């Protein structure tokens, strides 16, 4: 039991992917770098 | 399943089985010693024993004469049965034949047996003989027997 | 592959280099041809290079043999008894010089997989680890759940 119809990560019905804690931290870490890039490009 | 089935399946069926056995028995009466496949001799041996009993009834018993007429395909053997074979066993109640296994047949390696009517004129078969009473084991047992008989008489 | 070939541990010949260094190359046997294009580079190596190479290595006896041959070869023998044959067919003088120098520097042990890139006979100075190394001792060496003086 617990089959996903067709292929897992395409189509209408997909396997749900969830956002882990470290996945969030990874994104925020790169958001901080880009935010600083904005600053140094302002002068 | 063949529980309690005492007769073998031989030849081409029930009739052929009797005919096969009858030819063997006829040969035995004439020659008094024949060799044939072990299983077939074992099957025929019972008939060879009973034939003598019919022979002992005598040639004046019409039932015995009919039995002998059927089983002996060579009619010169019927006088032999009543006048030679049956008188020879007058003083026995059974055990008219002896059956011994002989080396396997050369061609098809069939298990083989020799059967003969006891008391024939032919050279004796090399019968198996039990160990001499003088052997070490038999002498030790003779001592034990002597000892047990002496203690009982006392 | 490693599984398809033999292997050995890193080692030396008679503890070489511990008290003194002894060159393991003991003999060199060249077989050049007076005529033959295959030996052109080997003939030029015997004219200017072999003499100066022997001056630097007085412990190596070099045997140059000029004879008809289609494939010139150098045979190197080492103190441990190893014998190595290397063809110098159609090699340049510089190529032969490099090969001959490499033979001089090698120990003569089999050029096969070396299991470890190091060797030591005294791996531990403070005592090799055992299961009791970091275990504390108890009064009267009593075992867990053991009644004393019963």
């Amino acid at each position: 039991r617990g089959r996903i119809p067709g292929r897992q990560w395409i189509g209408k019905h997909r396997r749900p992917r969830f956002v882990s804690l470290r996945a969030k931290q990874n994104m925020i870490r790169r958001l901080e770098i880009e935010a600083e890039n904005h600053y140094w490009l302002s002068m | 399943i063949s529980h309690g089935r005492v007769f073998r399946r031989m030849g081409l069926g029930p009739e052929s089985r009797i005919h096969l056995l009858r030819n063997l028995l006829t040969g035995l009466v004439r020659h008094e010693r024949i060799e044939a496949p072990w299983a077939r001799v074992d099957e025929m041996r019972g008939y060879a024993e009973k034939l003598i009993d019919y022979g002992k009834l005598g040639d004046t018993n019409e039932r015995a004469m009919r039995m002998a007429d059927f089983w002996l395909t060579e009619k010169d053997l019927i006088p032999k049965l009543f006048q030679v074979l049956a008188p020879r066993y007058k003083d026995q109640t059974g055990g008219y034949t002896r059956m011994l296994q002989i080396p396997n047949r050369s061609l098809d390696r069939a298990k083989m047996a020799v059967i003969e009517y006891k008391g024939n004129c032919l050279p004796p078969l090399p019968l198996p003989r039990r160990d001499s009473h003088l052997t070490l084991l038999n002498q030790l047992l003779q001592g034990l027997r002597q000892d047990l008989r002496q203690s009982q008489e006392a | 592959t490693a599984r398809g070939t033999p292997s050995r541990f890193l080692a030396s010949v008679l503890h070489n280099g511990l008290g003194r260094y002894v060159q393991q190359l003991q003999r060199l046997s060249f077989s050049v041809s007076r005529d033959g294009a295959s030996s052109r580079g080997a003939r030029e190596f015997v004219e200017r290079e072999v003499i100066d190479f022997a001056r630097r290595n007085p412990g190596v006896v070099i045997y140059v043999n000029s004879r008809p041959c289609c494939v010139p070869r150098v045979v190197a023998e080492y103190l441990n008894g190893a014998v190595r044959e290397e063809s110098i067919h159609c090699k340049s003088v510089e190529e032969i010089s490099t090969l001959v120098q490499k033979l001089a520097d090698q120990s003569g042990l089999d050029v096969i997989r070396i299991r470890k890139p190091f060797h030591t006979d005294n791996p531990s100075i403070q005592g090799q680890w055992h299961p009791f190394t970091n275990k504390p001792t108890t009064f009267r060496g009593l075992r867990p759940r053991e009644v004393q003086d019963p």
């Binding site: - | 399943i1 529980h3 039990r130 160990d131 001499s132 009473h133 052997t135 084991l137 038999n138 047992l141 003779q142 027997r145 047990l148 | -």
Partner: protein, 305 residues
């Protein structure tokens, strides 16, 4: 290194002597055990609820009909107890089981055909070897000293017993005889398919389930018949008449035990405990014990008045 048998090297004179000698020893050994209560018996405790006593080993003599007083006909199986003795007793702790066990053996056999380890076991026991040995779970109070003989009067008419034996062996058999499969039609085009299994599984699984019914060896396995009434006992010949049929062919050894069915629990209050000791018995039992409902052979013809 060549194998030998008992009379291989014996002479013509010694074979009869040895046969007689060993035969007499067997008979003498069996006669020496006929007085268990005069030979330091173990304590004979009274029956208590929850007590399990030893059973017997018997031989299937055959089948016989008897009629009850109402006129109904019941066929019974004759079970004869032959040379049944207690062989070994194992305590509850050493058995590795919930209850203590009592080993019982029946039917004497030739000593020449038994293993050395088995032979020396019987030598210290002082009995001739037994064809079959069965293990009976018992309570501590029901223990019997090894070497004590058991008789048919151990079971009394009116009680229910369980009989265990190997069934008649039919060899390799088809699904029709073995499992009662319907088979296929005789005519209407059937091609070489009359007694075949058919479909053995479904296509999807792609395998045959373990335990699927297929052609194989049939019979020759241990089966138990429960709740068989003991109609009558013959003390002279030690034959237990039991209701119905028991597994196995006639002349085979059967294990007879008190019935385990829940309805028959705690019915041993009036049965011999731990067993029946004929020597101890004050009054000799009649040659036949009958259940109250059985028509005895010499009773008057039934009349419905």
């Amino acid at each position: 290194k060549s194998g030998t048998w008992w009379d291989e090297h014996l002479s013509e004179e010694n074979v009869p002597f040895i046969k007689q000698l060993v035969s007499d020893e067997d008979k003498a050994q069996l006669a020496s055990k006929l007085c268990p209560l005069k030979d330091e018996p173990w304590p004979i405790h009274p029956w208590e609820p929850g007590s399990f006593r030893v059973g017997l080993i018997a031989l299937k003599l055959g089948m016989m009909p008897l009629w009850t007083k109402d006129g109904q006909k019941h066929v019974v199986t004759l079970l004869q107890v032959q040379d049944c003795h207690v062989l070994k007793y194992t305590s509850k702790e050493n058995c590795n089981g919930k209850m203590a066990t009592l080993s019982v053996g029946g039917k004497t056999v030739s000593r020449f055909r038994k293993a050395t380890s088995i032979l020396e076991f019987y030598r210290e026991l002082g009995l001739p070897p037994k064809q079959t040995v069965k293990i009976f779970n018992i309570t501590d109070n029901a223990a019997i000293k090894p070497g004590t003989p058991l008789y048919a009067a151990h079971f009394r008419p009116g009680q229910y017993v369980d009989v265990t034996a190997k069934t008649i062996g039919k060899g390799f058999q088809g699904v029709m005889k073995r499992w009662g499969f319907k088979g296929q039609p005789a005519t209407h085009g059937q091609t070489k398919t009359h007694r075949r299994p058919g479909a053995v599984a479904t296509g999807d699984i792609g395998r045959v389930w373990p335990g699927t019914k297929m052609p194989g060896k049939m019979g020759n396995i241990y089966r138990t018949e429960y709740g068989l009434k003991v109609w009558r006992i013959n003390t002279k010949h030690n034959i237990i008449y039991v209701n119905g049929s028991v597994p196995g062919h006639k002349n085979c050894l059967v294990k007879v035990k008190d019935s385990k069915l829940p309805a028959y629990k705690d019915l041993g209050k009036n049965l011999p405990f731990p067993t029946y000791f004929p020597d101890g018995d004050e009054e000799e039992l009649p040659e036949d014990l009958y259940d109250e409902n059985v028509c005895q052979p010499g009773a008057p013809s039934i009349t419905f008045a």
